């Protein structure tokens, strides 16, 4: 059911510039922002953020473990593809690593969210990708 999110209304699009959180929650918002991040080679930050969102919704124990593993090897391991996290935040992930839960990565997710909001988002709002997008929906 991204089908219903596919082509966003003007009223949906209107709420995004004043609300990064609203945009980050809309599939079409994230997809637009993800194009812009690709041009700055920082896409992985959003992909990590998305994977942490996907892990939170999961409920079956086995798939939580599989997903937590996948996030670690893709975004947190040194061996890639890695996102920049503080040591404080890395050591909390490591302690949560032997007994995984849906909310293991939340401090790391919040750190990368705050970076995107601070550094990436305001350059997104002045990008051609964005301004061209709002121009089309209007």
Curated annotation (Swiss-Prot):
Principal cellular location given in the protein's record = membrane
Cellular location of this protein?
A: Membrane; Synapse, Synaptosome; Nucleus; Cytoplasm
**Modified how:** N- and O-glycosylated in synapsomal membranes.
- Name the tissues where it is expressed: Predominantly expressed in the cerebellum. Also expressed in the cortex and medulla. Weakly expressed in a number of peripheral tissues notably spleen, lung and leukocytes.
Entry keyword set? Cytoplasm, Glycoprotein, GTPase activation, Membrane, Nucleus, Phosphoprotein, Signal transduction inhibitor, Synapse, Synaptosome, Ubl conjugation
Top-level taxon = Eukaryota
**Single GO biological process annotation from the record:** negative regulation of signal transduction
Q: Which GO terms describe its cellular component?
A: cytoplasm; neuron projection; nucleus; plasma membrane; synapse
The entry lists its GO molecular-function terms as: GTPase activator activity; GTPase activity
**Residues of the RGS domain:** 19-134
| Phosphotyrosine modifications at | 72
From the UniProt record, list the coiled-coil ranges. none
What this chain does, per the entry, is described as: Regulates G protein-coupled receptor signaling cascades, including signaling via muscarinic acetylcholine receptor CHRM2 and dopamine receptor DRD2. Inhibits signal transduction by increasing the GTPase activity of G protein alpha subunits, thereby driving them into their inactive GDP-bound form. Binds selectively to GNAZ and GNAI2 subunits, accelerates their GTPase activity and regulates their signaling activities. Negatively regulates mu-opioid receptor-mediated activation of the G-proteins.
Subunit note: Interacts with GNAI1 and GNAQ. Interacts with GNAZ and GNAI2. Interacts with OPRM1. Forms a complex with mu-opioid receptors and G(alpha)z/i2 subunits, including GNAZ and GNAI2; the formation of this complex results in mu-opioid receptor desensitization. Interacts with HINT1.
Protein's recorded name: Regulator of G-protein signaling 17
From which residue to which, out of the full length, is covered?
A: 72 to 204 of 210
């Amino acid at each position: 059911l991204y089908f219903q999110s596919m082509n966003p209304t003007a009223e949906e699009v209107l709420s995004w510039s004043q609300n990064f959180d609203k945009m980050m929650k809309a599939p079409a918002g994230r997809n637009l922002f993800r194009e812009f991040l690709r041009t700055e080679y920082s896409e992985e930050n959003l992909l990590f953020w998305l994977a942490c969102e996907d892990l939170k919704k999961e409920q079956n124990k086995k798939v939580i473990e599989e997903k937590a593993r996948m996030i670690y090897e893709d975004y947190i391991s040194i061996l890639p593809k890695e996102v920049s996290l503080d040591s404080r935040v890395r050591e909390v992930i490591n302690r949560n690593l032997l007994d995984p839960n849906p909310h293991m990565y939340e401090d790391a997710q919040l750190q990368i969210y705050t970076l995107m909001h601070r550094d990436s988002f305001p350059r997104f709002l002045n990008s051609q990708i964005y301004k061209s997008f709002v121009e089309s929906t209007a």
